[PDB]
Design a protein around this nucleic acid. Structure first.
Ligand SMILES: CN[C@@H]1[C@@H](O)[C@@H](O[C@@H]2[C@@H](O)[C@H](O[C@H]3O[C@H]([C@@H](C)O)[C@@H](O)[C@H](O)[C@H]3N)[C@@H](N)C[C@H]2N)OC[C@]1(C)O
Ligand SMILES: O[C@H](c1cc(C(F)(F)F)nc2c(C(F)(F)F)cccc12)[C@@H]1CCCCN1
Lengths: 231, 249, 67, 121
RNA sequence: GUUUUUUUACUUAUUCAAUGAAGCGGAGCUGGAGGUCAAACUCCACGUUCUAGCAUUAAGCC
RNA sequence: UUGAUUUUUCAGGCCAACCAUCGAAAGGGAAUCCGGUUAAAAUUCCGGAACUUGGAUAUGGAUUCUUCACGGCAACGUAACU
């Protein structure tokens, strides 16, 4: 016991060498890291026009979970599922029968930007989900206005990768429903009522709301002290 | 005509500085945490001659704050600094000859050398033998200090800029005449190729604007516009006045 | 489809939306090398009109040139 | 969310797996045979009067050798061709551009007997 | 209501500088003050100065 | 760099300030001398006597039960002496 003394190190200026602290704040990151962080910052600093600022307000966790719950019951055919349907149809036509009979009409999610745009323009889409992170943004920046003019309920959802895995792709810009089964019409109606309150009913007043204009943490510190001085 | 000697100097071929025997550049320490917030102690190891320079240099050793390692710095030696002396650099450093302090921490009238124009540039002003910078006044609200330079000019510098207390050593070189072309030869042998100098009026017209004529004479005014072009700027460039200076300035 | 909308939108280079996009993208492009590979066309409709297809063996590069 | 601790400010290229080549065809169909075998290393004996004097006295055999061969290859080559052991090999590039080797045999061998057996004396 | 001039605020464009991108910004502990009169409201500091030594690979506590 | 494991795979740990390369037959730089010998070579051959570097590895010695040697006031000494 008397041989285990306490030898406190002194880390003041001019004293013992500084210990290994966590210096992640001071790291010299590679150039691509710095570029992608400053891209996000610069989009926050400037004034964002309302057309782009629309995409900043996405469905909350709960409503998005409900949307993807409904929307997962209508996923497209995988390669294997289509393969089996095709062999079944081949059997039917090697008999006297045809393909239309043995396979029911499909009721699936609709994806693909050109396809979904043309579905909206024909008033065939009942619900459109738009990814918030599409780049270049002009691919979907007009979509809320189009859906408004066509009276098609829409929601800016989070995740082109989520929409992608819904339809067995890496990413998907949009996802749409043209129809659902009789058992699901109630939940689709409730979903549409919930999202219409934030998106299609607010579209005209969001047309007037600019985004961005947000300063950094140190600049917000300077403003706060100026606000307390006059206080 | 021909490219004049003025113009040839900028290509830097035979006119680059002769630097083999030089002893490293003389700079202050980098502004680090210790100098911003407290002070750091170093010890003078050597006072050495730097060829091409009139002022001696001081080799001063410091501990590295962040790793087990010794850091050597090359300072311009002020008069009275000796080998073995402890040197203190930082915001909290005492007002002693050889110490490095922010200009805001020095009272009015303090003599200081190797002063920074901008904070952290490691020294720009008052570096030659016998010269120094005087602190004239402080403007704490603006965090500015007013100083007097060797040329007589007055300047405003940030109070966070540093200087070294005292007068640069080696002062008084110019009080003794060189006496000889050979002494001038040995002087520039370790500086650059600027000596001897042929007079422009002793050349031919190809060589210089002053060349030629059946007597040696300039032939037009030697005062040249600031807006003149290269090949024309020989003589007294943009002179406000000429002739013997009489009276105060 | 969407390509017609993109065509007509890219003709409004002085609208606030396009001015914002051009500012941000010009800064980004100016941060990268004078010549760099682009992972995809920034104007897919324009690229389609000029012969691009989203196939293997089609490549997009970006370059800045002094004015 | 769970962020790395970095005790250095220098970011370095991370370590990634380096695979060995597994080509789907070999690049050279037939490997080359030995380019300096013993018969190409030793070109011919040198039997000038000066050379044979070195044979008679210093137990040294004198040969013309390939310009590209070194002392190790020459030692091995005489071992494989004549079953002798060299004490050393001294080499020389002649003014006509060919290489000459002065090979002194160990005391276990008689250079004159080996030279008679090789056939040039 | 849109427009010219002047002035001055901002920071992300752009520009200058330093570094092996090491301690920035804000808050808070600890103290010392300002006589308090409501309880912490303002301020300031926050481990190194007789000496040409030594400080590196954490002790200790839960 | 080790601990080794053979499994030609691992397990860690230590750091990466600096370091492409070229640039001297007078600068820097591991180590050879004497005698003899040829028509013509020699600090290169022959005879004798050494040295340096890189490696392997055995014996002898030295060290350790006060574990990593003793002596001298000291300057310092020694065949060794983590
Ligand atoms: C004249 N004195 C100035 C003083 O006025 C002030 O300067 C600010 C400067 O800090 C601001 O700017 C600074 O701070 C902002 C932000 C953190 O507030 C940063 O975004 C910016 O990069 C930085 N340069 C600049 N936008 C206005 C100057 N008057 O601070 C610096 C100073 C030298 O003391
Ligand atoms: O401003 C003056 C002053 C002069 C000088 C001197 F000229 F000697 F270098 N040095 C001063 C210093 C000094 F640099 F630290 F020595 C500090 C403060 C004032 C000084 C006077 C001197 C008497 C005491 C009051 N300050």
């Amino acid at each position: 016991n008397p041989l285990f003394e306490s030898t406190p190190k002194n880390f003041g200026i001019g004293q013992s060498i500084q210990p290994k602290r966590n210096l992640s704040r001071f790291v010299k990151w590679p150039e691509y890291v710095r570029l992608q962080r400053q891209k996000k910052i610069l989009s926050l600093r400037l004034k964002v026009p309302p057309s782009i600022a629309q995409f900043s307000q996405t469905l909350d966790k709960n409503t998005a979970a409900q949307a993807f719950k409904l929307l997962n019951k209508y996923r497209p055919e995988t390669s294997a599922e289509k393969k089996e349907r095709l062999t079944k149809e081949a059997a039917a036509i090697a008999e006297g029968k045809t393909a239309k009979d043995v396979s029911p009409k499909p009721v699936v999610v609709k994806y693909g930007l050109n396809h979904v745009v043309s579905l909206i323009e024909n008033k065939k889409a009942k619900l459109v989900l738009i990814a918030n992170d599409v780049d270049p943004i002009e691919l979907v920046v007009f979509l809320p206005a189009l859906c408004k003019k066509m009276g098609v309920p829409y929601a800016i959802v989070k995740g082109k990768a989520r929409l992608g895995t819904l339809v067995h792709k890496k990413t998907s810009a949009v996802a749409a429903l043209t129809e659902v089964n009789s058992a699901d019409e109630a939940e689709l109606s409730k979903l549409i009522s919930t999202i219409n309150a934030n998106y299609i009913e607010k579209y005209e007043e969001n047309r007037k709301h600019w985004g961005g204009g947000i300063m950094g943490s140190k600049a917000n510190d300077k403003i706060a002290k100026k606000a307390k001085a006059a206080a | 005509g021909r490219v004049i000697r003025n113009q040839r100097k900028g290509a830097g071929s035979i006119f680059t500085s002769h630097t083999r025997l030089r002893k490293g550049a003389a700079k202050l320490r980098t502004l680090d945490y210790a100098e911003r917030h407290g002070y750091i102690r170093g010890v003078v190891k050597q006072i050495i001659h730097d060829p091409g320079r009139g002022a001696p240099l001081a080799k001063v050793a410091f501990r590295d704050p962040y790793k087990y390692k010794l850091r050597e710095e090359t300072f311009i030696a002020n008069e009275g600094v000796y080998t073995g002396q402890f040197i203190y650099a930082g915001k909290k450093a005492s007002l002693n000859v050889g110490n490095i302090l922010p200009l805001g921490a020095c009272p009015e009238g303090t003599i200081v050398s190797n002063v920074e124009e901008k904070v952290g540039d490691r020294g720009a002003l008052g570096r030659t033998s016998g010269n120094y910078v005087i602190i004239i006044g402080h403007n704490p609200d603006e965090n500015k200090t007013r100083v007097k330079l060797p040329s007589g000019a007055k300047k405003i510098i940030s109070s966070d800029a540093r200087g070294v207390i005292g007068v640069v050593a080696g002062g008084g070189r110019i009080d003794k005449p060189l006496l000889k072309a050979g002494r001038a030869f040995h002087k520039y042998k370790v500086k650059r190729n600027s000596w001897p100098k042929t007079r422009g009026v002793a050349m031919n017209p190809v060589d210089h604007p002053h060349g030629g004529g059946n007597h040696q004479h300039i032939g037009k005014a030697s005062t040249i516009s600031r807006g003149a072009v290269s090949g024309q700027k020989a003589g007294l460039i943009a002179a406000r006045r000429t002739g013997l200076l009489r009276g105060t300035q | 489809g969407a390509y017609k909308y993109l065509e007509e939108l890219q003709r409004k280079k002085q609208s606030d939306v396009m001015r914002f996009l051009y500012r941000v993208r010009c800064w980004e492009y100016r941060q990268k090398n004078v010549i760099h590979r682009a992972s995809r066309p920034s104007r897919p409709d324009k690229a389609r009109r000029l012969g691009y297809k989203a196939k293997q063996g089609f490549v997009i590069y970006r370059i800045r040139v002094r004015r | 969310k769970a962020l790395k601790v970095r005790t250095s400010t220098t970011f370095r290229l991370p370590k990634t797996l380096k695979l060995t080549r597994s080509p789907k065809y070999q690049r050279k169909s037939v490997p080359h045979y030995n380019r300096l075998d013993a018969h190409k290393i030793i070109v011919a004996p040198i039997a000038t009067e000066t050379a044979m004097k070195k044979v008679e006295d210093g137990n040294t055999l004198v040969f013309q050798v390939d310009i590209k061969s070194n002392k190790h290859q020459i030692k091995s080559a005489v071992k494989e061709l004549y079953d002798v052991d060299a004490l050393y090999v001294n080499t020389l590039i002649r003014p006509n551009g060919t290489k000459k080797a002065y090979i002194r045999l160990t005391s276990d061998y008689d250079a004159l007997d080996i030279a008679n057996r090789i056939g040039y004396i």
